[PDB]
Design a protein around this ligand. Sequence first.
Ligand SMILES: Nc1ncnc2c1ncn2[C@@H]1O[C@H](COP(=O)(O)OP(=O)(O)O)[C@@H](O)[C@H]1O
Lengths: 216, 72, 360, 72, 72, 72, 72
Amino acid sequence: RLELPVIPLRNTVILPHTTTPVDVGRAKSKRAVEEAMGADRLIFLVAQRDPEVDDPAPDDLYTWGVQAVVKQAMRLPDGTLQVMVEARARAQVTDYIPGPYLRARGEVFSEIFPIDEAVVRVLVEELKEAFEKYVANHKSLRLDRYQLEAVKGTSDPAMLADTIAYHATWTVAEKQEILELTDLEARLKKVLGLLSRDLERFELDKRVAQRVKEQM
Amino acid sequence: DTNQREYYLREQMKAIQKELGGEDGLSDLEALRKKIEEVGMPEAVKTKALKELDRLERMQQGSPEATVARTY
Amino acid sequence: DTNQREYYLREQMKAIQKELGGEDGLSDLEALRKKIEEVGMPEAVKTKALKELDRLERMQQGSPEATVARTYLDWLTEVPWSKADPEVLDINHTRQVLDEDHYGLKDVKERILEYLAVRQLTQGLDVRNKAPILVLVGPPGVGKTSLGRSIARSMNRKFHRISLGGVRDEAEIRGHRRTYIGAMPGKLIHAMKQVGVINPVILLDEIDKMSSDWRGDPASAMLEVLDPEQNNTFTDHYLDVPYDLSKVFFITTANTLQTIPRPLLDRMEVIEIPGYTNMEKQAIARQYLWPKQVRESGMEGRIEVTDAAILRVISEYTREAGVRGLERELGKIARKGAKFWLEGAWEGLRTIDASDIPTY
Amino acid sequence: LWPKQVRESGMEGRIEVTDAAILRVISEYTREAGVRGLERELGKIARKGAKFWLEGAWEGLRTIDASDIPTY
Amino acid sequence: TSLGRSIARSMNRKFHRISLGGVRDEAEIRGHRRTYIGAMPGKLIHAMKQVGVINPVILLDEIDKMSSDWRG
Amino acid sequence: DTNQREYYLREQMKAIQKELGGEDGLSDLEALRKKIEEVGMPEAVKTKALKELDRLERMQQGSPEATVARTY
Amino acid sequence: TSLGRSIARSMNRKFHRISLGGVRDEAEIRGHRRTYIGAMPGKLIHAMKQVGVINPVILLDEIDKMSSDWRG
Ligand SMILES: Nc1ncnc2c1ncn2[C@@H]1O[C@H](COP(=O)(O)OP(=O)(O)O)[C@@H](O)[C@H]1O
């Protein structure tokens, strides 16, 4: 929501509808965690950039803030407050109000359900099959099975799309491009294209590995 | 372990082979062999070309005679 | 998909070649690959660079397949592609340029005026001449190269020079098949790499002072690299996919019309440039030769030479038709003035005159 | 021969040669047994006509009689 | 040469020519046995190479402008 | 079995020829590393020398890489 | 040579001479292709290596006793 505390995300943006733990190590983010504890377990998560600055900055954040309902908040004395957050959907960030701790106001979720939902469900099924093939073949590339088990039995197509997008490994710019796409089918098509690219790379890896063992 | 890794990475480098980029080439002197096959030539030409293709593939580096053979 | 898989191949090789056995290549094949498939040059470069991908990934020391690979890549991606400086197309501009830079015979100017008048009327929905190439015949001293420089300035093009009196085999003007380091593309690709745009004015020096000492007469290669309807789709042995020499200007020079090759005598318009007269040489000295010596040797406001001394030097110290001997005489005058100034100048502006020229 | 010259030198429909001038060129400007000399003379005529037309086009269609040949 | 071009056009095969005049040795027609970099065959092989068809119409230029003193 | 044992033993021979200290297999190798650095060369020369430096870490009876690398 | 040495003294530089009598190969003048051990660089390169200065005075003696032949 608006003027909600902001916790910079660690090393990548946490996509919505995914069961992920988020590390909180810096005290500047700890203060925002404490203030978010006063906002009824609701955090307007705005992520910072690639390799991070030790302190949150009013210019290194992203333009999409995801609103998350915290399942549980467990505390550790090692120095990191690992929070278990299950998000809802993305939302745009108007501007940046400096801190620390940082603040940022947003709006309602940008995920929308357009017309022609038959194509939506067809693309959801196609992407689910493509990701099942992608994960199943990627055992030599170390793709977990709990990630494949966490995408079955979903109601919202956005839930399935974001959950699969998180479980597939690529850079952060493509994740930002996916989160920018508010269309329910554009995100699915982008995930399908990225999975196709990664699967072509996987096929190249298999072919070159076969060549290596043949040479052996 | 260093020697094993070096052999493994040499094998991986040979595997790259360039794939779609390597479709013409195939480790070099292969496209040339196929083009020998592709061009309909007198059988004596075919035999001489195969003989000097066998004379090729002999570490062009440090041997410019392989270069003149490729020119032929 | 092809481009991204080749990008992955680039990433793996640039991660691996750090420990590669051959370091003569410098493991820069991937660093230099930023102009293979991140290229701002046309499809020919892309196709060869795809073929150049095969030539990579080997060792060094004696006839490398990788040093030649990166050398060919650099040659392909450093010769300008589709980049032309904005040329001004005027003949009146040349009318002023051939007056602001030379005393001139006023006879050789008009021949270049004719040729440029042709060059404005480039028709056929393209630019193609099928016409001669400004062969200039005369002594060395006479301002052939300066005429070329003035023409290039008039049309705003980068002038060049590549001697052809030092070529004896069809390999310093041609190439060699790219398979090993130690082979160099011809002098014309050298000149094309020297410039950064696709339309440079190029000069050719002492074509008539070229012979076939070794096996192979460079005349045929000259005719092939120059004929402005077959060279628009031309490469020598070193390069593979054609590079056009149609937009590229070609002015030429020689000393006699007898040893110019007979096949090259096609599309030649002889522009005869004779010597000069003593008054003309005196004006040349007092305008562009003696001032040249003055600010070359460091004589800003130091010494001035009376016209009598200039004409005496011309009539005494040089008889060659060119303005090279007079230039050298005035340069040695500048040297002796540099001394006779370095032991103290009697005034801010010393005076040179015909009385003591043999002293200088 | 002449039409090719004019079509190359960018002067079609903007210069003409009263073929008496062609006779003059043949009888005065070339003594060789072929046409290469004639084609060089007509090339010079084309280029000089282009130059003269480039100092200001005085007409929509030019003409060259036999008299003014030692001016073009 | 223009007659040869007309003949080739009538036969509808790509014309070509090679300035065989000024060739002072047998080596420029037969080449030499390849034993170094820069091993080059004769003029006729060049002509057939740049004409990518096996049935061209080659014009032996200036066939009466040769000399024979050395190298065959 | 014998070849594996021989490779093992020769490799401890390589691993004990490091002059005991293990700073370098040969003194000449570590001398060139600092001599390149201790001389102020342009970015075109120093940067390349830092990459042909990797041809070192070889010894006479092993790879002949250092045989000409040290001379260069 | 003694005038050269005196100029070097006056200029406060390092005199050095490399003889050029009877030289025909670029390998004699400058470096030859990097064939491993053997085929050492040429005369002037060795002269530049001898002096420890980057601005020396080099006396190219009997420079008119050279020769131009094959191999560079
Ligand atoms: N009208 C002119 N005639 C002759 N020389 C001139 C004229 N105007 C200037 N020069 C000078 O004369 C010199 C001729 O030398 P150069 O160009 O080296 O001759 P080349 O290059 O043809 O051997 C030029 O440096 C030029 O500056």
